[PDB]
Symmetry: D2
Subunit: 83 residues, 4 copies
Amino acid sequence: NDESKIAVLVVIYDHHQRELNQRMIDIQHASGTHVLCTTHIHMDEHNCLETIILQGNSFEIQRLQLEIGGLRGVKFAKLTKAS
Amino acid sequence: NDESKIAVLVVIYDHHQRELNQRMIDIQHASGTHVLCTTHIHMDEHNCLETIILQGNSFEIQRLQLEIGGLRGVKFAKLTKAS
Amino acid sequence: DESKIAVLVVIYDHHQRELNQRMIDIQHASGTHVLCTTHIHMDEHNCLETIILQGNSFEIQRLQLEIGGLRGVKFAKLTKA
Amino acid sequence: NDESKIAVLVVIYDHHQRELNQRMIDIQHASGTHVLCTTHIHMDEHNCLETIILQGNSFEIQRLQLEIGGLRGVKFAKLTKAS
Ligand code: NI
Ligand code: NI
Ligand code: NI
Ligand code: NI
């Protein structure tokens, strides 16, 4: 794209999954200003929910989505695209 | 239904609308949802983004979503059913 | 002139006429100084906010005195880092 | 009377540090405090800031704080006591 957008990626994962947290955070740190913040909810022993606020064009954003959303031990990864 | 469910309500609204932040907060205090928390981004002079994280039976989540969505100044008020 | 990050922790009563407008107006007119806010609705008359702030120690302290002095704020403490 | 209370724990840490993100998350899931939520700012390549919002008695909170305070790679870990 070029068109500048805001989005939320809602994630459910198990933090017991070996190296998952390391991957998700390295992806977000390596993505520059694309990631505004994350809010985390410790649901139970094997479920975390995260809302990851994202900003950029539609293509940068879906790509971030697919990176985080494909990792092993991610149960659920859904984009809400806003503007 | 009769159980525990997690949802994320994603809202974009105009904080220039008279009383709007105050009404959105009160709807949340008054609700028999347990709102776990709300994260807010001041996107610009006319746009705020909130991710409101909710727990409850579907009826109450849905009542929250409609009630927020029915406020003048809300531009976008979309729910992600997670859980 | 050194850029720093800070958390302003606020408790206030949302039933206070116009406190919410004033707080959000301050933050919106503060440019890139506010990163985000996280809100917990404690009970009928208490909200806790965690307001995350970025700038020099002066710009930050001002921001603090601005939110911090509004009528209806019970508590306004700054963590510097 | 019985004394469940609110606190904010503010943490700066190095996400490069070997499995620090997993361990902090793990400490949070395993504690007897109610962690309401964690907000995370990716500050730069070596710095993450978290705001951990907590509810419980002063003992379990102080336990959480000292425990996060003692992981290698955590750089700053101040509690703010609320009510
Ligand atoms: Ni968790
Ligand atoms: Ni705003
Ligand atoms: Ni509130
Ligand atoms: Ni980070």
